[model samples]
Target: NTVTSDVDCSVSAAWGLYKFNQKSNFSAEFEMPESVKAGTGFDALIKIKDISVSNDNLSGYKNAKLTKSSIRINVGKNVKLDGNQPGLSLSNGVLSINDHLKASLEGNSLRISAAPITVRLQALTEGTLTFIPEKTILTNTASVDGYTANTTCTTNADKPFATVKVDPADGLTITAPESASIKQDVQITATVPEKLNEKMDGKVQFFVNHIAAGDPVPVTEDNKASTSIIFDTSGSKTITARFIDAEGYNPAPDGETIIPVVTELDTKKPEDTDSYTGLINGSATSLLKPAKVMPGEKVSVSASLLPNKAPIRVYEIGINAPEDVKYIDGTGKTNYSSKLATTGSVFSSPGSGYYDPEWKNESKKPNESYRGFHSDTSYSVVDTSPQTVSAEFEIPKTLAPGIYMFQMGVYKYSNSLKDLVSIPETAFEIAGPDLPALPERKIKP
Candidate 1:
């Protein structure tokens, strides 16, 4: 069964450590967690109302001020003080402490619990532990002359007035949805069904596919720890929840739920990309020993594509040049191990859709723009980074040229593979061996 809460994000909350009270002219109370998992330390707050020494006067000492005080209470067998009390000081006889604190109190923060004595404790095992007040020796010493006075508050001898139910940690369980979309925020909740009371403490962490997803969320007062998650991956993923720093619960055996995450469709159009604007900056240079080539010589064209933006739905690059340049079918290759081949990504295309939108309208190999296309369309497998697409060309022996610019237009296809894209043109110098000075021209009569 799945449980849902409007408060998906986690919050700090607390619950059940019981309390014991004393009644008389001198009053005090003992507090502990409603329950605790054995072996972990928890804070215990002991507060006293009246200590009987109000004005700090000891009959024989001049300008007397109370400097040191010791307050004691009976400790039971089920729970023991976790460690020695930290450096404590008395401030103007006030004890530097406060009233019943929030359940969030722990460690050094619990020092705020106004009292003559504060203790941190841990339980021995799963059972009822008792601390019944017997007699307390509240003594105040005068700082002026080393004078001392004492007052005693007595209760029924070891008569279990306060009780702590020590319970070992139980397993953690969780509930979440069965399906979600990648990047969609969803909520998951964890619960310890065997908890003795409504109050719960500690943190619960969430995981995705065995990896931690978000921060550890606080277990709320209702005993349910929940968090909002947005998955970065898709497919059937594992969602897990486990306890952290929870004093009373056993950890591990993480509660898990599986979710089928769908890869969200990218609605960015081919017309909106830099690939369509010819800003993709694909490179083209002579792959032969020289950047410049000679007439009747075969030359290689190297094309590399690097796009600034990603999630390219499909792509095409057509290397264009002057009509006289002879196009040779070179065996071009890709870097991604032909994973793009699953979508029939080959060197042939709808012709026009190769790199320019008009290539398909014409029938010949070398159109007004290209000698022939270099690469074809990648339907489902889109290109994100640069790829190697090499093509060969032959400079005709009869053609005369100082230099020729070869142009290529990148295509990001849509409405089928025909959408037009980026344009980059580079030049290769064809010297009749090169540019030369003609016979000195003269305008003479």
Candidate 2:
């Protein structure tokens, strides 16, 4: 059986002493586990929700936000003990302190004959761990087995712990409308599952893939039990409900629900008709302009797009500069189809949901217009008009610059990796201009 859902854990074992941090790195404790396989190797899993860890105590019962804390137990045949239950005793060696790393054992063993060994630690904003003796640091390295809440990471993600699915004890459905005609307002509902009554704090998101016409449009809640949105279009769409909370709060339903609603697909999918002559048939054209600049000189680039089919909003305009050039641009808007639209900023990095259509909020990266792209990050359309974008770049002040090539192109992202897609009209080039050598400058001075 697999265990899911965020749950609390109280785990103790024969192991080394270490301080836990939210990021993957944790400071080692004063004491270390004698040896693995001695009695029943040590367990290096994280404790879940209520597992407390204060400065050095565990009893005061503070929450633990540890990531890479321990690796005391060696792999293989450590806890293959056989008894009435055929497992080692965990309660016997289990230890929990207040805020300190002291021991608080009550039972003979925390494991019996081969107890289902698993540990869960406190969730955090972001934490890390470091090994003093090893002189190394571990970043966001907490290994979480989607199967089991408890799992151990050797150095990277290595352990595969068994898991159990635990539904949020309290949840709601919230209702929405079913159908409507063109230009006519449609009803939306938000309901909760029966019997489960708990004051949940988060935004209620809507989806379409899960229902007809994908109505309701996965939305964020406003504290009230219900909300209303218009279906003033026609076509079959999908709808769903999502609850978005803070990092530590309730965080699930990350994607939009697929609800089928009868409305005009044109107006319904605003993104479809806005830019690029409606997303389905929208296309971004590139300018075939070549640039010339010195090795250290600054170069500026501009592109103009004309959509013959429809109004194509240029979500993002990219310029590939030579290795010696540094580029800069102001903050632009990200529309639903663009990174700015979802993040509300011209710059933000995507971390987890890039492959999924369900968008994540954005923040500024080092550059005002550029951001790092992880698994789920991409650019969005900023403006719907003008169909033109520009950027500036400065070449490095290094010498021996003869020639270099720069190319620019557009990019597009599909929700799934199962298909191969192409970017239409996307690339440009720039060549170096004549300039005096560095030695010549020094002689003139």
Candidate 3:
């Protein structure tokens, strides 16, 4: 329809009626059961009476009569009729047919464009069609001319259903070293967890000083893995073992360790020296003296002093004899054999001789075991005459007829001697005399 503003634009139309009946309205009775199960088939009948119509008033026209040409039927969810088109459709859990109709008779010239709508079913019976509670709905829709209607039904009896559950196992663990030295070889071991899932396969990797030491090791059935590593520099070092995750298992925290390195001291070599001097028997003596002697002869050995510019005091002084040489008089023997010997000194007051201050009863304090006894194990010297000290030893009477050479060491013990000194070492030679050979002894029975 088209409209003009606030005004009527209407067209005149005319038609004629052929004949007339006195009926002007209609009524119908529909017969159906009281209840039915969903998806069940049902049939119902409708009876109509007093249907009528009127024609426009025209010259020589007769009143028209109206009659039902065809009828259509539709029912609620619990019932279904035969020959329905746009068959069963489902949406939002609602099942229904849409805009579907059929001719009441096959040869009817005008087919029914709508259906007789119904909400309830008569004699309802349970059927195979079922719905899920909270998941399905049954709907019926009906419409005629300018009116429309809809109905919905749901079943809690039959439903699609499901349930879910969960339970989980424990996680993994790791271990590592706490301390190590730089460049030191270290052994690392990781213990596999005792309580674990049957399907879990663990792996262990080692880190040294915060650096990875090697590839990860697959853990064996023994529940343990081990590896060796070394650190190269001096510093606190660390070793760690990490657990690798596998088979849906949670990895363990790293096992870590630390160690410190040892420190070393620095040292230097002794300096070179060319000269040193010491007092012997209250006299400043030479550092070394050469000697020549004959077998069976008693010899006195002496050390000559190096000149001194000022007074010098020392803690002690003495002479050392070579191992092969012995003092015969010390043993009271005729032929030489293995024995230890030395030449000792007797001390006296240095009175105006070499400027040696007289120590308190000096002679008896330090025991003498060698060439010169200590003056209370100490001696002093000033500007004075050169000092000398001597030791005596005897050659064996049965000495072999060969040349033998030996050395005597003169040692000066002074506070200053903490620094190494060059004490002159003495040299000596002995000439053995010719001797007759001894006769051999015979064995007696």
Candidate 4:
């Protein structure tokens, strides 16, 4: 008779022979496999032990002088054992002895014998098995036969080794102005992933056009970092944000943004400028013209200013005559011949202000015909029109004749001293006829 039973085939299996010995406990202890699959090969061992049988139960063995008992183990006909001889089966796989074992009977007990069986499992009709530890169970029914032992064994099994995976959705967010001025500061803000703070050393990093903008900044409670940036030049630029990866978190997504920069304009004035223009001796010609006059000649000089924003509005015009060409009251000498006296008398009184006693004065009343030439007076004017001033002088008729130089300057009065706007000097003939003109040179070819 064979002993058959269901067993846990996932980890291991067991079989026993009993009833003949009148004892219910007689089985082999085996170590279950950590993993099982097709192509798996192993050796199954069954140690034999002496079995004592009651004389009454051994009716067939009641013969006189029985020597011993020997048992032969036969692998199940369908079991796939060593050398792939007879393969094992599925559909709730079962293992058993295909034939009876040969055993000998001894005096009062049975001499049991066993041999190592090499068993190799074959693939089930289903695909190769997958077992998750603590989640999968496998079972098998097995049997063993020899003498009066005929019973089945079953074992429940599970995987001893197993596994799990994780994927998260976290990234970076960036914020900034749409546009900025090269003259102003540019503020950039980077918002890190919410869960990134859980990392060992989490931080946010910023980039400008794929280059690192600054060192990585530690994330705050709000998971945000800000920086001030300034570009020397102006144009469209790009910025991106990333979170530095740490032990518990992956790198954050690169959130790129764009900003446009622009430049500003300049408007400042200079300390001094070409702020005035004029004429002398009533000549409408350019200042390049020579002031030629004869002795005893009545000299008339006039000058004017261009419009401006300077607070000063009053202006004066005067003649700078040397003693040799001093102004004359017919024959009376006055205080206007010297440089100081000449320019000073023009501004010395109500009509023409201060007087210095050093020389004769060349001051005179403005000509009635000149549009804005008020005679020898310091007149206040505005941007509405050019402020023109005029003065007259006498070329001392008593002096010797020849060439003489005289300076004419236009001045504007401010709270301080009069600012000289234009000073023009010219040479002229006195009591003498003008020199003869020269003819152009004829080139020889």
Candidate 5:
């Protein structure tokens, strides 16, 4: 028994090896979300299905050793892995990617479980992002003295397995006036998607240097958010407009503008009287008008016009008032009021004739309602004033005790009347009419 004998050991029982496509008995499917915003994240799934019974050649009784499988997703530039790195990397029996999402165990069986492979990814931009599953195959070699098979089933790489629509994020923008006088309302408007659309579903909040100047102004059907603010003090300030999310969109970005505010004289305070204040409808005129007037008292309202070097072919005057004051007399008979209103001449010429100033009344109360003048005749003058046009108004009896400005601007010509001759804003206040003490006779008790 210790003798080393050359024994003829014929050990060939049955050796069968087969190579088949994975599609012959199994199929692959890639899962992805239907849609997502451009700069967002989603999960992609790669599923393997067992269709062994669909192929009679690869029945359950066959010796198949499924060893390893590899999946390479062909996601383009717009689609990126969660860390913006390579998407797939497996070591030993685990696919180590995207937060340790894997389930693999080494066993002596060719049972490929129906669990899908997960990959977390990010979308960078808009449009349809396509993910194509490629080079997916299972290496199989099972031989218990029987048959072994390597099945190579791959998805149809000619088209996309999963597609996602990447929609564009919304945008916001702001617009405001360039310069405004002190203690005057300045309009600030915001546009969502530029306001040409029919429905913009959101609100906009306004801020001046991070201070909330206005509330969440709802976007109208015209896609615009409009509001106003008064710069009581003057200089430059930052105006920020932010969008609020409501129905279908999100608040991604905010809009901003830099606006300048000026002193009571708008840009500069002149030292002399290049501007004018004149007679109010044939009664009396004052170049230096009274600084204070009592409520309900009739007084002349003059908007001084500073001179323009440009030859005046015409003129337009704008007017803005404070709360509870009107530039017309309150001589009321029921709801209607009367005043000695006149569409007076634009100027008092040296020739003593009228300059024919016509009035276009955009007449409203308290806010910004401008009244303008139209003159068909061309008049050349360096000084627009000392020759004045005036109207009269009865101040409201219930006018609040606050600083009120009768702000006005005279425009010349630049194809359009875009030139500001004077932004003469007269500031006045009524610290309430001093009422007389009621008379009472006290009888001896």
Candidate 6:
């Protein structure tokens, strides 16, 4: 709006409504109707569990403080909508690690600001993240004096088994790594969570991707809460660890249990290493949520890291083919395999060296019955091809409709001298109603 000054020489015409678009006549006590009814001292609280700070953001704001937690904030003060800007911003602010944390979102438009004093998220309430970092603990439930569980023998698949009494009202939990990344020849370590119940057998099975890992030798059987393994990084890939109790026992009575408590690598990669530690343990985060697929449609999947970096490799992927579906090994065709085996194949990266040299070598064949972190099972050498890895199989013209699963990751070597490492596994599903289901057998009470 144009304005005319009181000065005599300033003979200009004034614009409509206000001579200068000023709020001189308006009161600064405008209140939000709903907020006034609920009480004006309102502020949104967000708790941050985990955060991925970019290299740039870290360099400037390495140590975040309480003020950093509140990226987006809103506070109604004085009047409902007529509050003054708190002048609060965080990004560049220091974080107090794990204490009272908060950030302010003021102004006409709520926006986030980091230290470099840069704005992060927009919309005070739109782009906010809050999470509670669960505490990581370790304990064994494998039949201690007070523990009533005992080891049992089972066959569906080899996993340590133990049976203890339960009221169906108690709770138990088992955890494994979310993910891991390491360089060739480097020793990568991951955490495995155990049961917290007196009846818990604490016999959990861990799988790298899906293949067995570590030695059959148990890490712990006492009340030691968790397990950590140091292994050679096999390649640039993904890893998975499974935990299951023997039949006739429930680890946790409560259905909502987050077992594996993964923590970021507390240390950095070696100076001479080709890999950098971005996330030491991914399992502490979340699994690569299974891909959603439709039946009868061919989906191309390559073996690679889930939360991947640049330039994924081919050999790092796992291949599985169920009995009804036909697929060829060593041909590089991306097909779903339910019963795929690493029996006779070798996987190697083309031209490129190991995807993650600091954590592992290019690739190699399985050597023996492998035992993962929790389970005590054995695997034998399967793949024996050079230049190419081929599992003994033939592709079929048609496949039964069903979901298929496979995995890729660092596996275990029975040979004591075998290097430490983790591998990537591929698990996929085939769509169709015609897919055959495993044969059922009669059960006797």
Predicted structure with the largest lDDT when compared to the true one: 5
Best by TM-score: 5
- The C-alpha RMSD of each candidate to the native structure, in angstroms, is 26.3, 26.9, 39.7, 36.3, 21.5, 28.4
All candidates' TM-scores?
0.27, 0.20, 0.22, 0.24, 0.33, 0.21
Tens digits of per-residue lDDT for model 4, 186-228: 8888877555556446666677656677887777777788888
lDDT of 1 by residue, 1-445 (tens): 1111110111111221312222223345666677777757887666654322222222333433444444434455566556655533223222222222211222222111133445677776677766544344233232333323222334444444366777765667777775555678888888854343234556777776666667878777777788888876444556777665545353335677766443332222454444311111233432111145567886655544455555554454455445577666433334333221111112344445333334445332333334223334343345456643445667788766443444443444354344222122244545433223222322223
For candidate 2, lDDT tens digit of each residue in 1-445?
A: 1211221222322231332332222222222232222222223333322222232232333222323232232212212322322212222222222121122222321110111233322111122212111112111122222111122322332322222222232344544443334455545455443221134433444543332333223222433334444654322334455444432233332322222333122121222222221110123322222123345565554433333333232233333343435655453222223332222123333443433222222221122222212211333334334344445656666733232332322223232211111111322223333222211111111
For 199-286, candidate 5 gives per-residue lDDT tens digits of: 4567777777667775788988767798988876544566777666565243345677866554444332343223433223333322
Model 3, which residues run further than 4 Å from truth?
1-292, 307-309, 328-369, 376-378, 398-426, 431-445
Local error of candidate 2 at residue 242 (angstroms) = 5.2
Q: For model 6, what is the alpha-carbon lDDT of residue 38?
A: 18
From the highest lDDT down, the ranking of the candidates is 5, 1, 4, 3, 2, 6
Candidate 2: C-alpha lDDT = 0.30
Q: Which candidate, 2 or 4, has the higher TM-score? A: 4
Tell me model 5's lDDT, rounded to 2 decimals. 0.48
For candidate 4, give the lDDT of residue 343.
31
Each prediction's number of clashing residue pairs = 13, 148, 22, 39, 4, 86
What count of clashes does model 2 give?
148
Ten residues in a row with the worst lDDT in model 1?
1-10
Candidate 6 global CA lDDT score: 0.26
lDDT of 6 by residue, 1-445 (tens): 1111111111111222211111111001111112121111333222222212122212332222231122222221211321332444233222112212222223222121233221122112212222111111001112112222211111121111111111122122334334432321322332233323244444433333334445422324552233344434211122332333444222322111212211112221132121211110121111243333444444333332232222212223233333343343344422222222233233333232223211223244332221111111222222331111123233244643222332222332222121222211222323323323322322324
- Candidate 4 regions exceeding 4 Å error are 1-281, 285-288, 315-317, 322-380, 398-415, 419-427, 430-445
Full-model lDDT for every candidate: 0.46, 0.30, 0.36, 0.41, 0.48, 0.26
